[model samples]
Target: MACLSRIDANLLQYYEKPEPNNTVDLYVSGSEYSNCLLLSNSEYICYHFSSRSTLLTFYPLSDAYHGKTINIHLPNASMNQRYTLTIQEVEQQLLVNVILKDGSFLTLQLPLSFLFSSANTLNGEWFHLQNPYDFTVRVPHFLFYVSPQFSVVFLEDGGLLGLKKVDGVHYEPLLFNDNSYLKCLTRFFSRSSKSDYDSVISCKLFHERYLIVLTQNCHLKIWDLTSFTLIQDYDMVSQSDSDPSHFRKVEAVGEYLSLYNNTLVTLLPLENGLFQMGTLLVLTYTFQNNIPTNLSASAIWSIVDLVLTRPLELNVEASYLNLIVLWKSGTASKLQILNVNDESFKNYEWIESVNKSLVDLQSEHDLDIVTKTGDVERGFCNLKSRYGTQIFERAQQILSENKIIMAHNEDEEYLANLETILRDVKTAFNEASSITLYGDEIILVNCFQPYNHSLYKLNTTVENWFYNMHSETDGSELFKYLRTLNGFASTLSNDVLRSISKKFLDIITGELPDSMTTVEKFTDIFKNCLENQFEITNLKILFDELNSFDIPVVLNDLINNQMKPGIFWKKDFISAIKFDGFTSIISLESLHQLLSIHYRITLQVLLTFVLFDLDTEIFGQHISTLLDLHYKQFLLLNLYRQDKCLLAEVLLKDSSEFSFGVKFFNYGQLIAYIDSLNSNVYNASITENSFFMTFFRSYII
Candidate 1:
C-alpha cells in the first residue's frame, strides 16, 4: 500500500545551469500542459500546446546529448478550437492522434527514422478516416485504440466499431480477415439487453491479443479479439478499495491505464491535483488464459499528472517491477524509479561475478585477482585491492536497495534455499574427492597429474573459507555454520575424517596468515579435536600395516624446510625448472644434517607432553591412547633407558605387540634385541625372499 516495497524518487532535472530548478515549466504550463513519452532509455519526447501550434522537444535522458534540445513546431489551422494530442506507437510507426473540437480525429504519421534523421525540423503526412460504402457510422470518438491493422473506436451508443487501414491515406470499416457470420462485421460488441450498456472510459490492448475495456461503472471487461469472446469482467471499484463507498463518492477526475509484463497499472487523477495509483496483478499472457482479477490502490500523492511510466528491465534477477515514473508538477517534472510490487523488492558481467563471489568469495575472488593481471600492464600490482573494493561496493549496492526492514515479513523460503544450495555444494565437492594412501601418509586425491588447476583452486578456496570464517565479520553466525560443517565432516569414515581434520589443521597453522587476530581461535578448535576427540591408539597398528612409508624421509623434509621460505611459500615461489629462472637449491647433505637436529629437538619436546604433562594419575592410559605406540616405545628405548618399572610396564602392556610382563626382561638387553628385530622385520619384504621361506617365515619371524 505504501508504494509497494520502497520508492526511489529522483527529481527530473531538465536543465542544469544558472537557470531556475523548475525550468521544466517551459514544457508544462498551468492550462495547455505538455505530455511526455519515453522515446528510449536515453531520451524522452515532450510536446505542449502553443497559441495555435504544438511545440515538440526531444530531451536527453542521459549525458549522451546533454544540454542539446531538438525542437519541432507543428502548425494548427483552427485558432479558437481546442485539440488534445496523443502520440502512440503502432506497427513500429509513431502516430499522433489529434482529437478536434467536433469529435473528429486527425492522424499524422511520423516515421521514427525520418524524425530522428534531421537535426531539428520535422514534417509528416496526415491519414484520413472514412466510412465504408459512404455510410457514416456516428460515434463520439471518446476513446480509440490504433493498432497495426485496425483503428478501434468505442461509440457512446455502447457499440464497438473498428476501421481497417487502407494503404496510408484512407481507412474504412474494419474488414474481418475471415468472416463467417456476415460479409462486413465491424462491431465486436453488440448488446441485446439494456443492462449490458456501460459507458466506455478507456481501452488498452494487452499482448496485442485482448482488449481491456474500462467502463464508467468502474468495470473492466476483457475481450479476446481473435476468437471474438468475452474473457473476463471485473468490478474495479470493489477490488481497488476496502471501503468502496468512499472511493465511489469521489468521481475520478481522469483515469489512465498502462500494462507491462504481468503488471497493469491505473493512474487515477483524484481531487485537488493528487493522484491515486492502482496496481492490477495480471496473469502471464504466455501461460493460461487469465487476466487481472485483483486490483488495489498502491499509492496516493499530490502530482499534477503522470507523463510517462516505463519498466527498468535490468539484467539481474528481480522479484519486483522496477518502474520509472515521470510525473509533472505545477512548475517542475520529476522522475522516480519505484520498486513496484505487492510487498517485496547492472554492469551486467562484473555485477554477476560480484554476486557469485558473495556466496563463495575465496576462489572466485582469487581467480578474479589472478585473471585480472593478464588484462593490465606490469605496473598494476594493486589489482587485488581495487577489485576487492569493487566487489564490496557492488554488494553494498544490492544490499542497500533491499533496505533491511526487520520484523517485517521475512522471506524464509529464500533462507531455506540458500542453505539447500550450500549443503548441496559441500556434498558435491566431498563426494567428488578421493583419498590416496601413499605409504605412511594419506593425501586427498584431487587431480590426476602433478598439479590440477581446480585442485589448487579448491585448496585455496577451503583454506580461505576457514580463514575468512574466523577473521571476517559476523563471527558468531559463521561459527554456527562452521559447527554444522564440522558435524557433516564427522559423518564420513574415520580415516577420511582424520584426513580432513589434518588438512584443516594444516590450513589453520601452515597456510593461514599469522597476523590475523582469530588464527589462534582457529588453531584451538582443530587442535582440540585432533588431540582429544580422535583415538590415536589404533594408529600404531594402522601405521604398521601401511609400512610407515619412509616416515624418516617425510620428517626429514618437514624439519629441513622442504617448502620454500616466506609466507605463501607453497603458492608463490619462483621455480628454477626453466633455464632463465635463477633459483637456489640447498644441498641434500646439509638439508639432512639440519633436519636431523630439528627432528631430534621436536621429538624431545613432544615426548615431554606424554611424560611430564600428565604424570600424576592414570598417566599411562591417557598417554598410551594419546601418543602412537611406536613413538612411546622409541622414547622408552632410546631417551630414558633407566626407567625401572612403572613407565616401562605401561608401555609394554599398552602395546599390542608385547604380551610379556616387566620381570621377564631387563631394559638394556631386551630393548637392544627388540630394536634389532624391529629393523629386520621392517626392512625384509615378501618380494625379496623365496616363496617357501617368505611363507614359513611369517609364523616364526
Candidate 2:
C-alpha cells in the first residue's frame, strides 16, 4: 500500500536509480524510510516542498518542534554501492546504517569495543546495537538487538547489558563480577591463536528464542535464547580442512541473511564451480529448520535458480511465507516468487507450475524443447521455465478497473485514479504502477516488463482511457460495457500501431542515443500487440497481419534497422548483410544453452522479411559480418569440449521451414572454427568428412 507503482519496458531504464523497486519489493508506512525516495544522484537524499523540487541532504521544517529531514551518510563506507539503508531509535539517538553490496556493514555506532571494557566493576550495563535490519526480541527482563558487528546487546526495555566472547577454546560471556556474568548473549565467536583469522561477522534474530551468527568462515552458530545456550556450530564447507588460508572457490561472506517461518535463507557468493554461469558466483542458500540438513544445492525455488549470473534483489513478502526475487529475465527484468518451506526447498514445487506454463506457452509460439527429467524419452528434453508466467490476466484486470477516471488531472485527481487502479492491480497481482510513454503508446506493467497498459495516442489516449472506463458494476454488465470501451480502444490501438509504425520507421533509420538495454526496451513496445491488434496464428500470420498495410516504406525502415549494426538488439537474428544487432549485445550454463544463441537480429524480424518473400533474400549474404557471431559460437564449442555432459546446439540448415535462400554463414571461418576443437578428454578426428566436417560440407560448402 505504500506507493504501489510498478514500471514496465518504456520506463525500465528510468527506474535504474531506484534498483529493485516496488515491482519487486515495496516497504510499507511503518518502514522508517517509507517516505524517503531513492534517487540515482546523491547518496540517500531528503526531499521537501520547494520551487525546485530539489533533493536535499539535510532539510529542516521550521523552528516549531525541531523536526528535521536529513539525508545521512555512514561517514566512511568502503563499498561503492549501498545495499540496504535504515534509520533507527537506539539509546535516544537516530542511528543510520547501510549494508553494502559486497556484504560490508556500516553503522553510526562503534559500541561493541566497550561491551567488555572493564571486567570487574559492573561495566556490563552499556551495550546497544544498530544493524541494517534491526530485529528485536524480548525475554524475561531485557530486549535484545543483533548488531552489524555480529554481537548481541540486551537491556531492560527502557535500560543492563550482556556480551560474550571466545578466547582460543573456552567460550563464555564477559563477566560483570566474580562469576556473575550477563547471560543473554552466548557464543559470539571465532578465536584462533594459531592464525589471525576469525570473528562473527554477521548475526540475525531468528525468533524470540533464537539467534543465528555467521563467521568469517562458512561456519554457522545458532544460539537458543530459551536456554541461552549454543544450538550448533555447523560448517557449510565440505572441505575447510583441506585449505584454510581463504579458499577463493568457497566464499562465506553473505550478501543477505534472515530467518523466517523456521527457514534460514542466506545468500553467499559462489565461485569457480563447474556450474558457474559465466560471471560472478551464484549467491543463495536455504535452511532446514536447524535440522542440519543439506538443502544448499537442491532448494531450487526462483527463476534465479536457472541463471544465477545477474545481480539480484530478493524481498520477503508480508507473511514471510514467500520471497520474491527480481532479475534480468531476458531482454528485461522479471520478478519471481520463491516459497520458504521445507517442501519448497527439497522438491522445488513452486517452479513446476511455472515450468509447466512455460512448457505449454512455448508450445504455441516459440521453439524451446523441455525434456522432462527421468521421462525415458530422448526426443523430449528436460526443458524448464524459459518464459516466466505471463501476467496478462492481471494486467487486463488493471485496464478493466481503471480505464475510467485516469486523467481528468487535478494533481490529486490524476494520482487518485492512478493509485486506485494500482491498488486493485496489486490486490489482483502484487505490483505497483510504473507507466512510460513511447512515441504514441504508453506501457503499463510491473517487473516482468510486459506491455500491460497499452495506450493509443501519445498524449490524449491516456485521458481517453480514463474517459471510456465504464463507471458500473454487475459482472457481465461490466464485461459487456468493457467491450464497448474496447470497441473504441481498438481503433485507438491501431492508431497507436500506425503511430508506432511511423516512429519505428524513424528509429530504425539510425541509432537511438541509448544503451542496448534501452533499445530492447524500445523494441519490447513494438513486439507487443494489445488484444485489439487482433491475434496472429503463426509467424507468417503474425507478420502478414501486422504489415498487411504494405507500409513498405515502414517495412523498409524495419529492414534497415534489422539488418544494420546499431539498430537491433545484439543477439537474435543474423544475416549475410552485416547483422547490426550482433555488434551490440550477448549468456552461459551446463552451462550449455543454445550454441546458436546468436543471430544478431530477432528471428521474429527475420520471419517478417521471409513473410514479405521479396528482395529480403539478398539481405542474408553478408551474415558473417556479425561481430560476435563467430566468437560466441567458438566459446560454445570450447565449453562442450570441457564438459562432456553438456548438450551444445549447432545451427544447421533445415530441409524445409526456412526460406529457400537462407544459407549457412561465415563458412571458411566457421569450418576453421569447428576444426579448432582440441580437447584433453576427447578423441575426435577432423578429416575430409567427420560429422563436423561432413555436415558443413553438405550444408555450408
Candidate 3:
C-alpha cells in the first residue's frame, strides 16, 4: 500500500541565497534550471544551478533522502541550455547520463548501494566520462524508455539502439552488425516515404510482452520482444478513405508514451471533428495471456488542444495514475481518471462503460442538488442501478432501514418523522411498482416530476401506514398523536390550503379532466382524506366538548353576524390565533365556543354539499364560497333540534347521505318524527296549515 506524506522541499537542500523568489521569470526555462531522476536503487539524483555553477546532488540513503543533499560541482553546464537525464543499471552499478542539446554528454557511475566510496569507483576516472556514441549525426529524443531488462533509445531519424542488462549492473549494446543482435536493433519505416525518413518519437513496453512504437507518420506498431516479430499495426492517422488527411492534417506529433497499469496514457496529435488538434487521449486495450482479447476505443478522453490554443510547452508526469501536466506558460492542470482503480476499459461487456457514465452523472447531479438545497423531494425521481435485479431490492432495503431508524428516533417530531417515513415508503413502492426487470437492463418508469396517480399512491401508502400506525396505540395516546398531526396541518394550513384550492379548482373546471392521467379523481382522494382525517373527526371531538348552552349561543352570534361570509372566507384565522399546549390563546372561551358551532356547520356542508353535491352548477356555486356558511337555521335552533334538523336535512334535502349524521341525532325524537310522518293524512289536519309542515318548510327546507 502506497501512502503520501507531505514535506518541505527546501528542508532537504541548503540554500545559500535568500531562497529565490523569481515569479517574474518562473515560466521561462532559463529560470533556476533543475532536473531530477530516480535511480534503480531508489535513490534520487538531481542536477541544478547553484551559485553560478552546475551542481550534481544526491542523498546517500534512499528512504531518508532528507536533511541535506550532497552536491558535486560541474563547470561545463549552463542555465540556458536544455538537457536530458537518464539512469540505467549495469553490472551491479548505477550509471547516470546527462546529454545536452549539442550532443555533448557526461556519465557518472555509482555502486548499487548508491555509495560514492565503493571499491568499483576507487579510480575516479569513472566519475566523469564522455558519451562514446556519434550522436552528432542524429538528434535523440528528449524522452527515452527503459524496459524491465533493456533501455531503448530512439533517434529522430527512425532508427533505435537497444542496450541489454548484463551481470546485474552492466549494460552491453546489441549491435546490428552482428546477427546475434538481430532481435534487439530495429528500424521503422513509413509506407508513404521512399527514403524511410519517418522519425521515431515515442516507444514503450506494451504489457511487458511487446515493444510498441509511435512514429511521426501517425503509425503505431507492436513488435514481439523475444523474436522481434511484427505483431500488430494500426493506421491511427486515417480510419477510412473519406478522411485520410483527418489526422495527418494535424501533423500528428507524439510527445510521450506511458504504460501505467496496462493503460496507455500518452499524447497523440489527432484532430477532433471540429478540426482541433494536439489532443492527449488515453488508450485502453485489453489482452489475455499475451494475446489481444478485446480492444475498446471507448477510453479515449480528449484533453484540449494545447498548440493552437497557446504557443506553450507542455510536460507530462504521472504519479500513480494522475497526469500532472505542467505548462511552461505558467499554468498547470491535474487530469485524472476518477475510476482508474476499476480498470475502466478492460471490460468486454458492451453496456458496462455506458452504465458507468450514467452512474457518474447521477452521482454528480445528486451532489449538486443536495448542495444547493437540502430537500430531495423534487430531486428524487429516478432510481437507477447497474444491477437490474438488485436495484429494486436495494432501494427497498434502504427504505426499510430508514423507516426502522425513523420509528426509533424520539427526538424527531412525529409529523416530521411521518413525513420522511411517508417519502421513503412512496419511493420503495414506486420502485416496486414501476420498474421493469430484464436481465441487466433496469428500465424505471419514473417521471421527472411525479405523475398524479403516483402521488395518489404516495398519499394512499401514507394513509394506510397512518391508520396502521394508529392501531398500535389506541385511546388518548393515539388521540394526542393525531392531534399533534392536526397541529402540523394547522401550522401550515394557509400555505397548504391555498395550493390545495388552486389544484382543486383545476379539477372542478375542465383544466384537469376526469381521466386516468388527470388529477380530477385524484384530487378527491386528497380532499376526502384531508377532511376525513383532520376536520371531521377532529372537530367532532371538539364539538362534543361544548358543555354550555351559552357557548352555542355565542358561536351562533359570531358565525351569523361577525363571521358572516365564512369561517375561512378572506380570513386569516390560523394566524389570527396562536396555539400553545394544544389550545389557542385567543380567548379560548370564544374560540372554542365558535369552533364548536363552526365545526357542526362545516361538517354538515362538507358532507351534504361539497362532497355529495352531484350537480356541477350546484357544486360550483357552493364551492365559490364553500367554506362560507349561509345556513343560519342550523346555528339558531336549539342543540337537539339543530342536530335533529341537520340529520333530517341530509335525509330529505340533497339526499346525498342521511346516514352520515344519524349517529349524532336523538333516537326518540327521531322516532316521533318518523311515526307522525307515517300517520299523516290531510283529513285529520284539514282545519288549518300544520305547524310542523309550516316550520319545516320555512326553516328546514
Candidate 4:
C-alpha cells in the first residue's frame, strides 16, 4: 500500500501510466523502444500507435509565440502487437521513444530552456501563435507537467544550483541556494516514501530500539534506529532452499519462519551454516585435535519441517506433521503437534505419494477402527511376516512411510493383568471394611490413677453428669453454668444416681448392714424436708447453720445416733470417701438456692413424696415392702397408684442426669409392677416392661 514516484529522468521508465495505481507497475519493452521518457514541467508528449506502426510527438507549452516540438517514428510493427504510452515528470529535459519491428528504438529529448524567450517582460503574458503555412497554432500556458513543480538544478559536482519555475514566456529562478534546494528535495523524498524503500517490503516500528524490515528477498532484517544500521539479518533464503519441497512454500509461522512447503524441515534456527535441501544433511562447524574440520554430511532430512507431536523432551512421532512456530522478532520456537499427511508438499513428490496413501486409508476405514486394528490386532501381520522377522522391524518401515500402527499382544497382556490386580485389591479392602461394622457400638475406657479418691470421684461424677445430659440440654443456662463452674451440683447428681443404684443392688443381694438403721434415719430426714416449705430468708438462715457443719461430721453424728453396732468397719468409712460426700454438700447448697424461690421447693416436694411414695414396688415386691415400711413410719401417707406411676414417669422423664435406657427400665418396670397390683392394669404391661427391660439390661447390665 505504499509507493515512491521518481523525479529524475533516469528512473522515469519504471512508472506506468494508467497504472494499476493500487500496485507498483514495472514496464518491460523491447530494446528498439527508447529508454522511457521523463516529462519536464514544460514538455507534453502524446504517443499514437496503429496495428502496423507507432509514433510519439513532444510539444513544449511555454510561450505563446514559439513552441518546441519533437517527433518519433516506428518501423515493421506487427498487427497483433500492442504498444503502450505513459507520461511522467523527471529532471531536466522531456523524452519520447518509439519501438520498431527489429527491436530497434528512437529517443528524443527536449530542453526546458528552448521553449521560452529570455525577456523578463513576458513573465505573466498570455498569447497564441499560428503557423504561417499551416493552420496549427501554439497556446501560451503554464508548464505544469513536472511532478515536483519546484526543480533543483544541481551542478555537475553535486553542489546545489538554484531552483526555477517557467513563468508564461520566461523562466523565473528562485533565490534559494543549491544547499537549500537539496535539503528540500531530501525532505520531499523522505515524506513521499516514508513507508517504503527500494528492496524493503515492509517497515514497522518494532520497538523504541529497533525497526523490523521485511525485505523483498524474503529475508528479515533488524534495524537499530539509534545507530541507523542493520544489527541483524536472518537470511530466510538459506532455509528457503532447504528442501525443494519445503523451499517454495515458506510460510510465516506466527512471526516465526515456517515452510509453506510440505517437506518436513527440522524446527531449528539456521545459525551455523545453511541447511541442505532434498537431502537431510546437517552442516556443522567443528574442530578436531587442533585444526578446524568439516564433518561428513549427515542427514537431518527426518527432522526437516517435521511437525512435532509433542515436546522435544518426549519421544518424537513421525506421524505428527502439523507444528506451530512461536516467534519473537528474530527468534522462533515450535509448539503443538499435527499430522503430516494433512500438509501439502511443495515440490517433494515422495511426500505426495505418502499423503495419497494416507488419504486412501482414511477414506476407506474409520480412524478408531484403523487405529485399533493397526495397533492391537497386528492386522498387518502378514506384511510383517513377509518382509521381516520382527514386528518392530516392519513397524519402523511402515512408520517411515508415514503409516499408523496398532498396539501389540504384549501391551494387551500387561493391561489385562493390571486391571485384574486392581479389582482383587479393591474387593479385599471392601471385605475388611464390612467386617468392622459388626459391633453395635464401641466404648472407650480409661484406667484411673490411684490417689485422692474423693477428688477423683467428684471429677468423674461431674464429667458423667455432663455426658448424660449434654444432648438434651447442651445449650441450657444450668448446663452452661455447670460446665463453666465445674461445680458440685453437677457432680452430686452423677454421684447420687450411681451410688444409689449400687447400694440398692447390694441391698437386693442381701449385703446390707445388720442394723440398716442409717437408711431409716436418712429416709426420715428426706420425708420431713419434703413435707414443708419456707421463705428465702428463713431458708438461707437454715442453710447457713447447716453449712457450718462439715459433711463428714454430720454423717458421723447421724451414724452414732442411729447405728446400733460395729456392723460398719473402718474400710466402710474409707469406701465412703469415694462417694463424693463433699460434692453432696455443694449440691445441697445449690438446692437451697433453688428452694429460696419457693415454687421450686413446693413443686419438688409435692412431685416426690406425695405422688411417688407408693410406686417403690416397681423394682420388686421386696422394694415395695421396704417402701411401705419407710413411708408408713415417716409420713402421713395418702398415695394413689395412678399418682405414683405418673410421678415416677415424670421423674424418670425430667431427670437430666439419668441415661435414657436406664430410666426406661426403672420407670417402665415400675409401671408394670403397679399394673400387676390390679387385674385390669396387669393385662400385658409385663410384656412391655420385659421388652424394654431386655434392651436396658443388654445395654448396661
Report the number of clashing residue pairs per model.
0, 26, 6, 29
Candidate 4: regions farther than 4 A off: 1-208, 211-213, 227-229, 232-312, 316-701
Worst 10 residues of 3 by lDDT: 450-459
Tens-place lDDT digits, model 2, residues 1-701: 00011211111111112111111111111101112222222112222211121111222101101222232223333222221344333443334443333332334331222211222222221212223222234211212344422234321121123433244112123322211123224454223122233334445665444666555554566666555666666665542234445444222222234443444554442321111011101222334331111223444322222111111112213222433333222222233334433333332212101111111223333333112122322111111112111232333345547564333323344443433443344233322222222211111122112112211111111112223235323323322323333333233333443333333322232233334343342454445533335444443444444543444443343334322223213222222332111111100120122232222122223223322343523443321122123233333344333322222212112112321112122222221222222111112222334577556633421
Q: Please provide, for model 4 over 398-426, each residue's C-alpha lDDT reduced to its tens digit, 9 standing for 90 to 100.
A: 44364333355656553333333333322
Model 1: weakest 10-residue lDDT segment is 580-589
Q: List candidate 1 stretches off by more than 4 Å.
A: 1-44, 49-85, 89-93, 117-146, 155-159, 175-198, 227-229, 239-245, 249-256, 265-319, 322-701
Question: C-alpha displacement of 150 in model 4, angstroms?
Answer: 34
lDDT of 1 by residue, 373-409 (tens): 1223211222222222222233334443666222323
Give candidate 3 misplaced runs (Cα > 4 Å): 1-66, 70-84, 88-94, 99-105, 111-132, 142-150, 164-197, 207-209, 240-255, 271-329, 332-334, 338-701
Single out the weakest 10-residue window by summed lDDT for candidate 2. 581-590
Per-residue alpha-carbon lDDT of candidate 3 for residues 637-686, written as tens digits (9 for 90 to 100): 22212232233333233212222221101212222222222122101221
Query: Rank by lDDT, descending?
Result: 1, 3, 2, 4
True-structure lDDT of candidate 4:
0.26
TM-score of 1: 0.33
lDDT of 1 at 95: 74
RMSD of each: 27.7, 27.4, 30.5, 44.7
